[model samples]
Structure formats: structure tokens, C-alpha cells
Target: VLKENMKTTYHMDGSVDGHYFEIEGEGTGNPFKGEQELKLRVTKGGPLPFAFDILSPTFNRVFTDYPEDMPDYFKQSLPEGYSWERTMMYEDGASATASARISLDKNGFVHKSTFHGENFPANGPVMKKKGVDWEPSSETITPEDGILKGDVEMFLVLEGGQRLKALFQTTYKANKVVKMPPRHKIEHRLVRSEDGETIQLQEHAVAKYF
Candidate 1:
């Protein structure tokens, strides 16, 4: 969003809960999180988009692909619409395995953190982390969570055996009183500009299963 304008226009593409709702557009800003250029996004659910979960100690897995297959013990304790879509990001500025994860509980308070940073040369290519306090509206969630939210095409994470080491985090606070409008369309990409040349950096596709 430009500094001069305080309103973000919605770019509509679909419906929410069978109701005609314009995909959410930005109203507030998280200048510290995401790709900096990235704006608020939702998982195509309720009226407001919310922060997504990425990590949890209970399973050690960032995102769950099959909530239906969950162990009987967990299934019994899980909430009616409770599910997750592990969210992670390798600080583009950081070339190591610096991954940030969030585990949003049923009440919507998310527990988030980052891990590892042992890949760069001493003082060389220092990881420049961004998005320390960025927060989504109220609809973002993993595929497992999407199943409850009504999304049809859900993507997973990639697992190639390669490992990265890093650590970082930011508290993505969910709105307690104010709720934003519903949104469905979101664009995510990487970009780099050098010597008057703009480059659209190729990004790793989200995995189909994790």
C-alpha cells in the first residue's frame, strides 16, 4: 500500500461460505513482516483473515496434511473446526535454514518461533530478517485447517532431505476487537532489482504433502 492512501481496494475472485464477498484487501499494514512487499492474506474463510500456525511441539511436524488421520487421542481433544496449515518462511535476506513457524491454537492465539542459522560465513552474508510483527487478518490456515474452512485446492510443503539452520520469530497478534472483511485472492512471489534490471525470482513451490 502507498503511504498517501489509507484504503486498500479489494481484488475479488470468489465467494465465502456461499455468500458473495470480495476477497480481502489491505486496510492495516505490517511493515516488518513478510516479503516487506507482501500484504495481509486469508485462507478464504470467515469475515476476517487470521494468522496461520506453523510449529507445534506436540507433533514436531510444522503442518499436518491429514487431520482425519490424526491419532484417536488427539482427534478427541481437537476442536470442532480446529486444524492447521503450518506456515514457514526462510528470510530471503538470510541464506541459511532460518525458518519461522507458528502454531495457532483454537482460541486464535498463535505460538510462533524460528530455528537454526549456522550456514553463512562469519559476518559474511548476514541474515537480514524482516517482518518481525506482521499479522494476517483471520483466515490463513494449512491444508488440514482448510478442510474445515472449505478450501478445495490445498498445497503442501517440499521435503528434499536438505536441511537449513536458523532462528528468529515475531508475535503475529490477532485482532481482538476489530475484524476485517473477507478475502480469497492472495499473490505471493519473490522479486529482486539490480542495476535498473528487475528480476522475478523463482520461488520454491509449496509442497503437496508434509
Candidate 2:
């Protein structure tokens, strides 16, 4: 075999248009991790590898702009904070696992996220229950609930930093039988900043189940 086995897979600069980056890691705790170059550019529009373009400039800012106010969620001093809610049930019980970090400037001008998850061959369907919708199910655990509420604010900064924010919530549920590669269903719902107080973003995705 030739010493060169494959084509160069990335561009370090414009390849990612100054924003966004691809993350490669065991995502569980296998101790192996890496990164893939990522980019978000209006001029290069055609097809996007992931659905991120849908959140474009807004999502891009997470990488470009530093949050001025530290989120209480980020200050909880835990690797996952409220994120533990899910991990508490699924972490090692299922095969693979995932976790994320979210932050928004104190005034709610900037919102960002850093996430990682790992997939185990047969550990995807461990969190399902047979009754009331476990998600969109706002059953907040008292003290923790109070802590989350008192410690957070999200600002969605629009043009010229005219801050915009909403009641944003996150949810994740999994179904092992949803086709192969399995799936780890994840969703995000954000309320609007305007008087309408509408849902500005509602997205869901199923990825390799863990």
C-alpha cells in the first residue's frame, strides 16, 4: 500500500469560515477524542454537513463571541450540572452516554453550547418509561429547580446587540428501535423575545444511539 492512504480531509482556515468547529471524541469516557474542522459561511451556501446552518449567525456567535456573564448553569461547579438529570438515569446504565454545557450572557445576549456523547453497542433504550411524557414534562426538582431559576438568564442578541432572549428549555429522550444506528433523540425549544412570546426554535434529531 502507498504511504499516502487517503485524500486530505480538511482545510484549517477558510475550511470553516472563522466559526464553528467539528468535535470528535469518545464522547462517553473512552479517553479517545479528536476534532474535525467546521465552517459556517453565507457565501458558500449549497449543502451543509449538519443542520447547524439553520441557527447560523446565532449559533456562530457562540464560537465567536465570549459570554460576558457567566451562566449559573456553568458555575454550578459540576461537569454537567442540571445535565445530570438525564445522566442520572442513563449514564452507564445504557451503553453509551452524552453530556453538554450551555451558557448565555447574564443579560441573555449570547447563547452557546458545547456537547459530547458516546455510543455503546447495546445501551440505547434504558431511559424509556411507559406512561406520562417524560419530556416537555416540566417536573423540576424543588431545590434544584429554585437554583436553576435563580441562577440563569439567556439573552439572544440580535442585530447591533439589541438583546433578545426567551424561555429556552432542553429535552432528550431515546428509542432504541427507531431504525438502526439506533438513536438518541434530542430536542430544544426556545421561546421568542418579542411580545408574541412564541417558540422561535424547536428542533429534534436522532443520532447513533448509545
Candidate 3:
């Protein structure tokens, strides 16, 4: 979002089972582990903004698209009416994969991780360490306990009423509670006043996956 033209206002809202709620981001942390309810916005926008906004930190887009047949398993166990994201990265001997699900249904998610860095995360480039498959290895890609390789999606049930949903893509992961990875690099091609040049804006890895 460093295009110097578009402004971003993270909104995490939707019909929380008919509650008409607006999820407030700057009001809470650690979903079930921190405060009572996720900060619900009162003035206008609600958690609805954060729902998708939270994913802004780690990824902006998927460079390598998973196969079209993307193994129905890749998208298996996803929650209904929620926008989710998947991020996986592997290089040398390192790899990690995770996903974030955004549903108005509070019950449809987990701590994700005590840290979204834990619950799940986004950001990072990929390299060809293997023969072909550009995916994460069996090192850091761990599910709560029930996810299988190639499942491409899962939930540890840090909470309940959730589903599954990664790759080396990047997003902003800007929520205070939700953090970005260490090597997180966000790519923003924007016009700069520094000589009116087009440069890659260096900042948060705000992914734009809808």
C-alpha cells in the first residue's frame, strides 16, 4: 500500500452470527488468551477491518500459485463466510507455513498462536532447494496436531469452531498483537519524491490477499 495513492484502513467486521459487530484492533490482544472480547469498534468500523487487515503485515500476493487442482486438500477444512490466508516459505534448510482465518464467528478461530508469529505468519521469499515442488519442508510447518503435509491448511484449535487454510507470500501483519516474521520484506512499488523515481518501497510486508 506504499503506492502514495491508496490509503489503508484495516476493517475486521461482519455479521457475528447476527450480532452486527465491528472488530476493533487497537483495543485488544491474544483473542482468548488476553482480554475478554476482541475490541469491537463503536464509532464506525468494527473488527471486520482487522479480520482482513491483520493479514496485511506478512504478504501482499502469492508469487507462485499452487496448482489449479491445488489438492482440494489444500483448501480443506476452511471455515464458512470467512476470508483466510496461507503463507509458506522454504530455503536452504528452513521452512515455515501458517494461515489466518477471518470470520465474524468468534468461535471460528484459534489464538492462531499466542503470537500470530505463532498462530500463523506471512512474509518471506522462496528459493529452489528441492527438485521441483516449491513448498515448505517438514521442519517448521507444524499444525496444532492434526494437520497433514499437502493439507496446505489446518487449525490447532487454540480455540474452537475453526477450519484450515500458505506459501512464502507476504503481508503487513500490522496488528500490535500480530507480529511480522524476522526476515519479513514487503514489496511496494511506488512513486517517490526522491527524484520522482519508481522504487521498491521498504516497509511492512502488507499482503493484499482477499
Best by lDDT: 3
CA lDDT scores, all candidates in order: 0.23, 0.22, 0.24
Off by over 4 Å in 1: 1-95, 98-107, 127-186, 189-210
Per-residue alpha-carbon lDDT of candidate 1 for residues 1-210, written as tens digits (9 for 90 to 100): 112212222222332113222233222222112222112233243332111111111111112222332322112222221223322333333321222222234332132223232233333222221112112111222222113221222221223322332222222222122222122222222222222221111111111212
lDDT of 3: 0.24
Instruction: Write model 3 residue lDDT over 59-129, tens digit each, in one string.
Output: 21212122332222112332331223444432223334335443223432322211032222122121111
Clashes of 1: 23
Q: Which regions of candidate 2 are displaced past 4 Å?
A: 1-88, 95-108, 122-135, 144-146, 149-210
Q: For candidate 1, give the lDDT.
A: 0.23
Pick by lDDT: 1 or 2, better one: 1
In angstroms, how far off is 183's CA in candidate 2? 33
Per-candidate clashes, comma-separated: 23, 6, 46
Ranking the candidates on lDDT from highest down gives 3, 1, 2
